[PDB]
């Protein structure tokens, strides 16, 4: 039948204009006294899913 979509993946990425995926950053939940000021400033900027990971989870997000 119809192919199902990974609901957990749909809550973490968004598709860009050229078909790429825009993701968020990790290591930002708590324990902020153990990280430098420069580290925390640069962890607030979004990134892109790498090409190595894209080849593995491309079928998961096909309706997105």
């Amino acid at each position: 039948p119809k192919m199902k979509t990974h609901r957990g993946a749909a809550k973490r990425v968004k598709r860009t204009a050229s078909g790429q995926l825009k993701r968020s950053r990790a290591f930002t939940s708590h324990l902020f006294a153990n990280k430098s000021t420069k580290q925390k400033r640069q962890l607030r900027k979004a990134r892109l899913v790498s090409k190595s990971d894209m080849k593995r989870v491309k079928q998961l997000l096909a309706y997105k």
């Binding site: 968020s24 939940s29 990971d53 989870v57 998961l60």
Partner: protein, 144 residues
């Protein structure tokens, strides 16, 4: 003629059959390998991952939410309005008929991308700042 039928060149290809002797190239193992999980009938691992280390979509956090009362507008640019002759009235009842708007979601919004070079009158739900002056630069008026 029914007794000379020729399909288009380069439009048909014969399929591949495995396990039909060693001269074909896919005889014994049928392109699978030797003695693995992926060499058995029943597949391998899930498309995401199976076992192993933490998956990528498990070590990243969720972001944002969604709005129940979201409105989406069908956008028509200035260049797309050159079809209508100058000095005529343009209505959402006319843009749909003329073939410019296929699906009117919540309204018509005029975006000023291009060049008008016309003398027409258009009414729509919303207008952009750039499209407001361009319509009135050469003459005309807009009504909401």
């Amino acid at each position: 003629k029914l007794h000379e039928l020729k399909p288009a060149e380069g439009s048909r290809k014969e399929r591949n059959r495995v396990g039909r002797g060693v001269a074909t190239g896919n005889g014994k193992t049928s392109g699978r390998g030797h003695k693995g999980q992926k060499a058995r009938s029943g597949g391998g691992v899930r498309p995401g991952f199976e076992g192993g280390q933490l998956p990528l979509f498990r070590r990243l956090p969720k972001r944002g939410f969604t709005n129940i009362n979201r409105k989406e507008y069908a956008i028509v640019n200035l260049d797309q309005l050159n079809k209508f002759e100058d000095g005529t009235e343009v209505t959402p009842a006319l843009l749909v008929e003329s073939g410019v708007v296929k699906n009117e979601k919540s309204g018509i919004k005029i975006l000023g991308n291009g060049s008008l070079d016309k003398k027409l009158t258009v009414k729509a739900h919303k207008f952009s700042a750039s499209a407001a002056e361009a319509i009135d630069a050469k003459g005309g008026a807009h009504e909401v």
